[PDB]
Design a protein around this ligand. Structure first.
Ligand code: B12
Ligand code: SF4
Length: 567
């Protein structure tokens, strides 16, 4: 038999982000006695087939895992998929080996049945994969059937079918049977809450964390899996899990310390929301502070922590703990200010809102008082949006004086989001719904609710593909933001006008401190044709931290990079 597992990173996006998933999976598999090799194609974009050809001629893994982090850019005006490029890589893999292929990933978990069938692979995993993957590797290595592996999606001849999880929720003392889609499960049992995830650098066939760090990819640290809220736009409760799988505090800080020891000082939390499940977050910060104080030589004394938060809970004690631990920046998904828009959108599982604008105001103030940078995010175009609701949000958000204020437009729809479900209900398989849009749509988009679909794959694929299999990435954009539908226009032309309308709301004296969506022709639009001079300047001068922490001074940083190159 063989105990060799290959893990492939097909992510070709630059600036590059380390495939943290593979470090989690490597640790679990190695701890269970398997040999793991990683083939990272991110730094082999221009010759990834050569990389594959070399590997499979020399090595014969008995299982091949592929991490699919992003399905598309998720920019509603762009609709640029990655799954076609992912399939090309998987198709080449299957030409080189008969070993089974298993897929996983956060993006993968938003539509895992559709992707198992689209990629033509044997197995898929929805949610955290470290435990399921070990059971799968054990079954394959021992030549066993995989029909008893809880949670495993298996591609049968009639489509993808999931083995039920063994851990079921309980209501009224009776277990609740699993959904054939596996949707909106807690998935805590899937999480390795104990181990320190080994983060290596310079090791062949392992994720090279320092390489990503030197190319701008901040250290990543997971503290807890899942999200217990149910925001209507958000894939993460379903795709990650609806309850918190909290990691052991000592293991998280051990991992952060290991990163810092290698010089990976800027670390970004990879929780869904760092300040939800707040007691764990505060206990984590307390432990970081305790280690920093206990030993001046502990490399955590140079930690630069970057976190992502919701507006609440964010109190004075939390801000003091962030400051003491080394937090340099907080990114907050405030998203809007109007209650008529936030109602039914930014909600708990019970359906109620959980913050007010005062919570964002307090967050920004507390961070300002402590020298912590802030990025406040807004999303425009959700149901209810009109030009006056956008202006009201712009005016209120801009007055915060956040370090950076980021604005997004439109929503890419996914099958296991309240928005996607509700919009599919409105279609009921017989009509289109207001606000539904796709740049490649040939006529009205008629979605089907899950109960009207023959399979999970059918329900999932319709949000990305049309009936003929062509890419047709589905979006929502408030009809309150579009001109009268009687004036004909190209789909991308309407998006262009909507983006231009938003730009017109920003005072030019504030452009230095805002991030706006752009399309071709607009100021500072970034394309795949030419390099970003700001990104190259940050690297050349050795700037550290989150990209947005240097946005205000981007012109100066480019000037100084020109100066340093000449000197
Ligand atoms: C932090 C973060 C970022 C940071 C990354 C910082 C850094 N240095 O790491 C920044 C801001 C840079 C970022 C950028 C982007 N992000 Co982001 N990001 C996240 C976030 C919150 C955490 C990602 C993470 O590291 N998670 C922790 C790791 C361990 O989890 P994981 O990858 O899911 O891995 C587990 C499972 O998926 C599974 N699994 C994974 N791979 C495999 C493989 C196999 C074989 C198996 C069996 C299982 C398996 O097991 C793993 C271990 O438990 C996620 C949401 C989330 N909660 O995951 C969004 C998210 C992944 N990002 C998203 C997007 C859209 C992007 C961008 C494309 C945005 C853009 N247009 O530029 C870029 C892409 C960057 C790139 N190069 O790939 C979307 C993806 C949606 C989709 N449908 O694809 C998400 C879901 C946010 C959202 N709610 O929309 N992001
Ligand atoms: S946006 Fe809402 S549902 Fe999504 S991760 Fe944040 S709190 Fe959870």
């Amino acid at each position: 038999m063989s105990r060799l597992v290959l893990l492939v990173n097909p992510n070709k996006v630059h600036p590059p982000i380390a495939p943290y998933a593979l470090d989690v999976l490597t640790t679990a598999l190695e701890d269970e006695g398997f040999e793991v090799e990683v083939l990272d194609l991110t730094f082999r974009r221009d010759d990834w087939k050569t990389c594959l050809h070399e590997y499979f001629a020399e090595r014969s893994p008995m299982l091949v895992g592929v991490t699919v982090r992003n399905t598309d850019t998720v920019y509603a005006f762009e609709q640029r998929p990655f799954v076609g490029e992912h399939r090309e890589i998987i198709t080449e893999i299957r030409r080189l080996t008969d070993a089974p292929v298993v897929g996983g990933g956060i993006g993968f978990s938003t539509m895992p049945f559709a992707l198992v069938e689209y990629f033509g692979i044997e197995y898929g995993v929805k949610g955290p994969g470290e435990k399921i993957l070990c059971e799968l590797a054990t079954a394959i290595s021992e030549g066993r059937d995989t029909a008893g592996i809880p949670g495993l999606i298996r591609n049968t001849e009639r489509g993808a079918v999931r083995v039920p999880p063994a851990v079921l929720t309980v209501r009224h003392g009776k277990t609740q049977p699993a959904e054939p889609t596996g949707q909106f499960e807690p998935r805590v049992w899937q999480v390795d809450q104990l181990s320190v995830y080994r983060r290596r650098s310079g090791v062949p066939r392992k994720v090279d964390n320092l390489e990503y760090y030197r190319r701008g990819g901040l250290g990543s640290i997971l503290t807890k899996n899942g999200c217990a809220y149910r925001c209507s736009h958000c894939v993460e409760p379903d795709a990650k899990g609806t309850r918190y799988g909290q990691r052991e505090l000592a293991s998280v800080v051990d991992e952060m310390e290991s990163l810092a020891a290698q010089g990976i000082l800027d670390q970004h939390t990879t929780d869904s929301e760092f300040n939800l499940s707040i007691a764990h977050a505060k206990n984590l910060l307390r432990e970081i502070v305790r280690r920093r104080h206990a030993d001046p030589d502990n490399p955590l004394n140079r930690l630069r922590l970057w976190v992502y938060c919701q507006p609440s809970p964010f109190d004075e004690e939390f801000a003091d703990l962030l400051a003491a631990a080394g937090c340099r920046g907080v990114n907050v998904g405030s998203d809007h200010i109007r209650p008529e828009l936030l109602s039914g959108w930014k909600v708990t599982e019970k359906g109620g809102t959980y913050y007010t604008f005062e919570d964002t105001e307090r967050l920004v103030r507390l961070c300002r008082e402590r020298g912590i940078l802030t990025m406040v995010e807004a999303l425009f175009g959700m149901p209810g949006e009109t030009p006056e609701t956008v202006r009201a949000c712009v005016d209120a958000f801009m007055a915060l004086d956040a370090t950076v204020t980021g604005f997004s437009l439109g929503l890419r729809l996914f099958p296991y989001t309240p928005m996607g479900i509700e919009i599919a209900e409105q279609c009921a398989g017989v009509r289109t719904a207001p606000g539904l849009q796709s740049n490649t749509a040939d006529g009205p988009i008629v979605l089907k609710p899950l109960r009207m679909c023959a399979s999970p794959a059918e329900y999932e694929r319709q949000f990305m593909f049309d009936e003929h299999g062509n890419f047709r990435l589905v979006c929502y954009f408030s009809p309150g933001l579009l001109p009268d539908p009687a004036r004909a226009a190209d789909p991308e032309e309407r998006w262009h006008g909507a983006v231009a309308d938003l730009w017109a709301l920003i005072d030019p004296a504030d452009h230095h401190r805002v991030m706006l969506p752009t399309v071709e022709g607009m100021s500072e639009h970034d394309n795949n044709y030419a390099d970003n001079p700001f990104l190259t300047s940050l690297g050349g001068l050795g700037y550290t931290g989150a990209f947005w922490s240097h946005w205000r001074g981007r012109e100066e940083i480019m000037r100084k990079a020109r100066e340093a190159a000449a000197q």
